[PDB]
Symmetry: D2
Subunit: 117 residues, 4 copies
Amino acid sequence: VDREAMARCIEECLRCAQACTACADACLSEPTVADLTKCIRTDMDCADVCTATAAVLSRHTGYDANVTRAVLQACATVCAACGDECARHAGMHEHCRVCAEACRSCEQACQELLAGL
Amino acid sequence: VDREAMARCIEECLRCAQACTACADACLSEPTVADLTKCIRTDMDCADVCTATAAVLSRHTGYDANVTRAVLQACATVCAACGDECARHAGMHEHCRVCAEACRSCEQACQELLAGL
Amino acid sequence: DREAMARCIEECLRCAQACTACADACLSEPTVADLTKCIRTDMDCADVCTATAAVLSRHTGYDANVTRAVLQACATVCAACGDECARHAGMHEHCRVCAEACRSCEQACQELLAGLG
Amino acid sequence: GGVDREAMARCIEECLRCAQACTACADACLSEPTVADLTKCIRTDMDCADVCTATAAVLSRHTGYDANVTRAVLQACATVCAACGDECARHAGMHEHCRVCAEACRSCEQACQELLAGLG
Ligand SMILES: [Cu+]
Ligand SMILES: [Cu+]
Ligand SMILES: [Cu+]
Ligand SMILES: [Cu+]
Ligand SMILES: [Cu+]
Ligand SMILES: [Cu+]
Ligand SMILES: [Cu+]
Ligand SMILES: [Cu+]
Ligand SMILES: [Cu+]
Ligand SMILES: [Cu+]
Ligand SMILES: [Cu+]
Ligand SMILES: [Cu+]
Ligand SMILES: [Cu+]
Ligand SMILES: [Cu+]
Ligand SMILES: [Cu+]
């Protein structure tokens, strides 16, 4: 994969983690928090996996590409799941709309890197 | 289910992350550090993925087996890779021997949970 | 102090996991709306403990100012998280357990702070 | 209030940029033939990236806000960014990756210090 595409994917992961954390926090402050618990949980998983993925991608050398691939697959899966749950709430909550978009961009960047590896 | 296997896997991830970070640090202090850079990188990847995996496994609200499986697969893959690289240096460095064993035990615990889910 | 360092790293990793588990358990409570500060403080504590475990693993003794500043942050957040979990500990065993993990990590951090000088 | 939330957003952005700069520097140092001379740089890069990502997360949360916690995390971030900048600056003449990282650390340090002065 391109070193520039790798840097772009790292940036997407770092930004997606932050977007998810912001959304989880916003959901926690909603009066309807009891209806947003899966959103919050999936936000937390996505942040944790994105954070790990950003770090792993920063050290990618092409040797043991199996590690990089496995981490990207996990990140794409969690970003997709988080985006799906945020998108369910996006009509009611702008924070969920914003987070869904960040999750989709990270998902796509991870898939692009997976295809290029 | 397999609540005991889940608890065991979480514990293994926490132990493995510490073993990996200790190994990375010890490699950085070796006079032969230039020969240990893949070990260091893979140690760091393994610690990062193990701590994310322990976090994801600890969460039951809004459980999504797709996420759980993907993260476990990533953890098993990175633990296997880290174990392999540490094992190359285990004859020369006790820190690498110890880390390899921790990686193998975590790999097996992840695989066991994957099979039981 | 190498033993106290290893103990503190272990405490930080365990405290992060305990906080994650508590946050998740609170998210699944029907009274989740009453537990939002607990959840938020759990999330902060996990994030700070995770960073602290990593930073302590690389401590070399020179640049003790980094180690001290991170330990102070970890002790502060652990104490705050323990205080908030303890508010709910009579009603929720998960909060009781989490408070105890926060206290043990707080003390391990303070012990290292006193020994670094 | 309003000015605080904008200063927080600025600091979050700086932390995310700084973490990436630090991880790029750490990786580049690991690939240098002179890696044995760059081990403190690598370690401090990793500390800075870890603390920056934690700090960005803490700053993103407003539910149940506790200024004492937020200040302690910002102090840690300011301290580690200053330390990382100092160590990268030692190598900046020889390595562009270290020069770039030093500048990112200084900008993040200042954003954290701005928030420390303003909150608090
Ligand atoms: Cu969501
Ligand atoms: Cu949402
Ligand atoms: Cu949201
Ligand atoms: Cu969301
Ligand atoms: Cu080792
Ligand atoms: Cu190792
Ligand atoms: Cu090794
Ligand atoms: Cu709590
Ligand atoms: Cu709890
Ligand atoms: Cu708690
Ligand atoms: Cu609680
Ligand atoms: Cu540096
Ligand atoms: Cu450097
Ligand atoms: Cu550098
Ligand atoms: Cu640097």
